[PDB]
Amino acid sequence: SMNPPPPETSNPNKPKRQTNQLQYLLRVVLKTLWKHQFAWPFQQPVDAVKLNLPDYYKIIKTPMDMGTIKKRLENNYYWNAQECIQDFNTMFTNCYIYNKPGDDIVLMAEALEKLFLQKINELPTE
Ligand SMILES: Cc1nn(C2CC2)c2c1[C@@H](c1ccc(Cl)cc1)N(c1cc(C)c(=O)n(C)c1)C2=O
């Protein structure tokens, strides 16, 4: 029932790049998804203690949320856009794995993912 340490958002040894694709992921993709009415359960790591979910962190081995992605974008943690796209896809896939199809949280995740996939389609050229 305990919460694990949050995902890594700072690593001096990890190589970084500030690219136009990563800048678009912060100013366009993250910003749009963040103000959505269904963003609030995805804005911070799942608090298994507060929500009384002792099985969450036994099912989910690669936790991810938009708060962690936001910090990784602000702190220039990524090497490329594909690394950030992988964090968003992991967050959505985590929601589908833990929860049952047709749950309210799955409907919320599916609406955010539809919006994310449309913004990712308009990813500018490197
Ligand atoms: C209540 C409540 N309060 N919080 C915290 C943010 C204030 C959360 C919930 C639930 C929650 C939120 C919406 C629905 Cl429709 C159902 C359950 N939740 C989540 C989030 C994710 C990704 C998840 O997969 N599960 C299993 C729980 C939260 O983070």
Side-chain angles (χ1 to χ4, degrees), residues 79-81 83-85 87-99:
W79 180 249
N80 59 24
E83 216 183 326
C84 184
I85 295 169
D87 287 345
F88 277 104
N89 283 323
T90 293
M91 178 184 76
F92 298 130
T93 295
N94 283 350
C95 186
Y96 310 149
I97 296 304
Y98 182 72
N99 305 281

Side-chain angles (χ1 to χ4, degrees), residues 7-15 17 19-26 28-30 32-34 36-51 53-70 72-73:
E8 188 173 80
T9 59
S10 170
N11 197 346
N13 288 318
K14 185 190 187 295
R17 275 202 299 194
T19 72
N20 64 291
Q21 279 179 347
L22 285 160
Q23 294 166 340
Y24 168 93
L25 292 178
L26 176 61
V28 175
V29 181
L30 194 276
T32 292
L33 255 56
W34 194 269
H36 197 270
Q37 59 165 335
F38 299 150
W40 64 268
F42 308 90
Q43 283 172 338
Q44 63 284 303
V46 163
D47 192 332
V49 181
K50 173 188 160 70
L51 311 172
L53 308 171
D55 60 335
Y56 190 83
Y57 287 110
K58 293 170 195 289
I59 300 297
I60 303 302
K61 311 304 208 182
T62 316
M64 193 53 56
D65 60 279
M66 295 201 302
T68 295
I69 297 171
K70 178 173 192 176
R72 287 175 171 195
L73 289 170

